[PDB]
Symmetry: C3
Subunit: 201 residues, 3 copies
Amino acid sequence: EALREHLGTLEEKMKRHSGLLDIHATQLRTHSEHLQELEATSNDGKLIWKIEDFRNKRESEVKGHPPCLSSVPFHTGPCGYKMASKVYLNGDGEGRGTHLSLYVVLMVGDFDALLPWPFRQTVALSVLDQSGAGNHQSLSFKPDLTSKSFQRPTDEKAGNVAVGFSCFIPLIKLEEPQNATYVKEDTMFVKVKVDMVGLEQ
Amino acid sequence: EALREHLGTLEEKMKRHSGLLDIHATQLRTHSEHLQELEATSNDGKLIWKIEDFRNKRESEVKGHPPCLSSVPFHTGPCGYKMASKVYLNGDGEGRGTHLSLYVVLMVGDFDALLPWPFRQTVALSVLDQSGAGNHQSLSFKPDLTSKSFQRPTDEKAGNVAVGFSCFIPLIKLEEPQNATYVKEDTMFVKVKVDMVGLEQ
Amino acid sequence: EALREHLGTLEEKMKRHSGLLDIHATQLRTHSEHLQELEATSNDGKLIWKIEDFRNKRESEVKGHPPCLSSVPFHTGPCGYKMASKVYLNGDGEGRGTHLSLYVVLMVGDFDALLPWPFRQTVALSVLDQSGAGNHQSLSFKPDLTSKSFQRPTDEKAGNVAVGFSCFIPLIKLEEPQNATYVKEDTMFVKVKVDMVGLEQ
């Protein structure tokens, strides 16, 4: 039992090692998510989203798994409002199954206390054209005070209620349009433009 | 002793694993510190500091532990001077115990050899008002050549001698002023403005 | 064999732990490389390279090990062309052994599909002067359509064929010139300037 006590001790020491690896693994995973956010985003209130592996992303979207895609959080100015973009890729609500839906979700920001609410900044949503013709599909809207989506975010991880266009583009047009390309080499690009500040405009 | 040699070997192998986890842990911790620095800072020579958990930070400050708070290093232009801000939260020197002290510390920069010395750039220190009135407490100074604080930093981890205002604001005013808020939802904001370059001004 | 089965199980469990540490180590190493890239670079199409431990870097360059030095990838605008700089430090091709060679390598970029090819942006390569006189050695060129170096990069990790000046500066001049310093406190600086966009220039 001299060795047995020292053997039981080794086993409990071993298990502790196994706990640290899971803890370290999660911390590595969170680090990698934070790194991508820093690399991808822009703090000018403009964000370009490179969507890749479209067909698998689209087929997987037909399945329950990955119900919608999400961007990396971006900022409308360095210490301005923080928000993210969600693309359904096989529709949501009114556009579900026949349209690609594109909306932007406001998220809890570090500097929300400084900023005024509700959010009044115009937002422009577009899908870029890889052909270089410049015939993108772009749509824009002015926030309505009435909507609870523009209220200061409190939902932390979830973010505020998604707002945007359910019927952004017909899937047939998206897949194959006459005017442009939209999906080239199984990759699509999504652009979001927000006016970062007004002053006297 | 055939097994014993192989058992002693396992134990020494086990200990090696335990060494790597401590080494990996430190490297994760340093990574997390570097990530925050990238996320929080601005390279325009302007920095906003979000101070959170004020009351605990203040009560802990009364105790020996956490004698002063520090910011993330920020840059006055992308390859300009590098510096950090230190807030005492219960005073230092002349303001100790009745005033909040706010100073900025110059730190060893990557591009110090390119830059001229001593530092001649004006610095503006302010505490923001959460109310939106705009009645912040803001003070600014022009560096004196005489001071050793504006000499090229050699102190590496410590940084150069802190310079600023000991009596930035009375604690009574800070806690509850008529003019503004200053601490809202147990969070305070500190702003530092530096002119990034002169040319012909 | 009751214990033996449970002892064999521990050993196989131990080996699994050892696999995760190597996997975690590589992921930490890749994280550190990504962190430096974020910290060092600029997305304005201008990059400053701080080369340090010059003499060891130079002596090691004489040896087979470290045949050339490389920068951190930088971008010519936020979603523009992505490229890196390579300095030979004891020459390559026409300048080998008597000149320091300085070239820039185009790399596969995230937004290559958006951008037009071939690359037509002017590039300026310079070595800074630590003295503050301003007498740097700076040279610039306009890309030739003919060259395969300005073709869209497909070489992934390697990047596109290096293009630049083999005979950027004589080593004797580099080591000790009358006009300037170039290497101060065993550190050298390399600057790359690219015009980020034209429009109507």
